[PDB]
Amino acid sequence: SFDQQGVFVKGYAMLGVTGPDLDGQDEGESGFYRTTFNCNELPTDECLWAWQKNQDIPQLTSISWSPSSQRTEWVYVRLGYDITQYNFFLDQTEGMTDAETLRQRAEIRFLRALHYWYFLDLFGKAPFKEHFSNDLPVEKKGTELYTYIQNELNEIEADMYEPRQAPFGRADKAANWLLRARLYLNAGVYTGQTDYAKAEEYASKVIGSAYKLCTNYSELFMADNDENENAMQEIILPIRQDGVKTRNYGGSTYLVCGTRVAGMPRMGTTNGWSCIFARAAMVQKFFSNLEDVPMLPADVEIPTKGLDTDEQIDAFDAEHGIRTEDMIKAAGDDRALLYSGVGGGRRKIQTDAISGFTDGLSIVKWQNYRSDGKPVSHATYPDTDIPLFRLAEAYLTRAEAIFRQGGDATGDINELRKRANCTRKVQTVTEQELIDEWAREFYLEGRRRSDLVRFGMFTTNKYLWDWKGGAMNGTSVASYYNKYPIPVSDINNNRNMSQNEGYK
Ligand SMILES: OC[C@H]1O[C@H](O[C@H]2[C@H](O)[C@@H](O)[C@@H](O[C@H]3[C@H](O)[C@@H](O)[C@H](O)O[C@@H]3CO)O[C@@H]2CO)[C@H](O)[C@@H](O)[C@@H]1O
Ligand SMILES: [Ca+2]
């Protein structure tokens, strides 16, 4: 019958791997991480999908999707399915009072609350169901959904592990506080009423916990981030990932293999999909003047022989100051983990036509190499865990909250820039400085869109980036695009759901 341990483990496993699956989906495409990541990244200023022919990619890239959007449905169906599983577990263990089950239920309610946030943040409403049954989910709009989420988190806190006391991979009170802080920071968006004071309060609780910032930014996204204390100390909520276990159906697989192509030095994998690369605007977060970006001159030819090894590739790049470490030095920021070297071919910073992977610089933030230099478990699938929740979010969140209230946010911003060994310290905080910092600190971590919406820059002219709105130099779009549409399939199946404003 009911396998409490098995169902509990699946609850967390759903965050980082696929068994919710739909026709037209390749390996692991229904994934919770991939679907949510694409909805918050592909339409942003952080990256571009190289294969514009793939279905619905042009729509997501340009922010011009419709209710029939395949990717919108993929993430909608996944978020919903996951919740049905959390409701199943909670119903099957109702009434149990043993210590572990109390923690398990608290954590499951946490995961459910997290999924509703995604619904809230992405659709502004959600197909709501508290229990597992055949009854059609009822629609729960913004503010009501907001209050429900905040209440869930407030009530389970007591039964959750203390900060850094839960097995690595499970959520604790700090994960609860960080999420509430996120809800508060976006309260104005979801309710129409801001609550920056509360955002600061909880961000502070997190900062006050045992969690500390990793001293080496890159280590947070490496194969051993679940064994390297320096990294573990900052990862409040990691999605466990292991080469031989998760294999090709995980999230970090998408992050590492997806941003690489044969020829690049230290691929960390045998299969580079050459799918994800940065938009010119992303590069600009580290180089206000794109002319300062280390690049191979056009008049310099790329040898067709003598560049088959990492050793040969690094030397050629070094000769021309285009190794990623040179990129970091030119940027004066440890987070400028970009690659403009010759590995994989001549790169462009900006393009006037999305034709291929090389039309932009490569992003090497995610790596399948251990900081301790020891062997990883697999040659193709990465061991790198996805640090979904990081202490750094608390700092940027409180920084913005403080700024929004009219206070001095310089301290929290310089705390992250200092950790990143930035040569430039922020003297005064501004809206632009903040939103740019969110990009620098969390780019390619699946949250960009949400931040852009809050700053009122996602659909508007307040901020134009390359390829935004389908225009090469960037153009605005209808404001109703700040919320994805309700998949037309669910509109036809659940008479309780109503389409979001704007869509037809
Ligand atoms: O290798 C030549 C092929 O290059 C292009 O295929 C792309 C896909 O379009 C892109 O989505 C990605 O596919 C991966 C897929 O998304 C993932 O679910 C699966 O598990 O791995 C796939 C990669 O093996 O990357 C591939 C390869 O770059 C092109 O569209 C295709 O027609 C070419 O045959
Ligand atoms: Ca791991």
UniProtKB/Swiss-Prot annotation:
It comes from Bacteroides thetaiotaomicron (strain ATCC 29148 / DSM 2079 / JCM 5827 / CCUG 10774 / NCTC 10582 / VPI-5482 / E50). Major starch-binding protein present at the surface of the cell. Mediates starch-binding before starch transport in the periplasm for degradation. The keyword Signal applies. Interacts with SusC. It comes from the Bacteria. GO terms for biological process: starch catabolic process; starch metabolic process. This is Starch-binding protein SusD. Belongs to the SusD family. Induction: By maltose. Pfam families: SusD_RagB. Keywords: Calcium, Carbohydrate metabolism, Cell outer membrane, Lipoprotein, Membrane, Metal-binding, Palmitate, Signal. Pathway: Glycan degradation; starch degradation. Disulfide bonds: none annotated. The binding pocket contains an arc of aromatic residues that complements the natural helical structure of starch and imposes this conformation on bound maltoheptaose. Binds cyclic oligosaccharides with higher affinity than linear forms. The keyword Calcium applies. It is found in: Cell outer membrane. It is a lipid-anchor. Ca(2+) binds at residues 226, 241, 383, 385. Disruption phenotype: Abolished ability to grow on amylopectin and pullulan, as well as maltohexaose and maltoheptaose. D-glucose binds at residues 26-28, 34, 51-54, 249, 273. GO terms for cellular component: cell outer membrane; outer membrane. GO terms for molecular function: calcium ion binding; identical protein binding; starch binding.
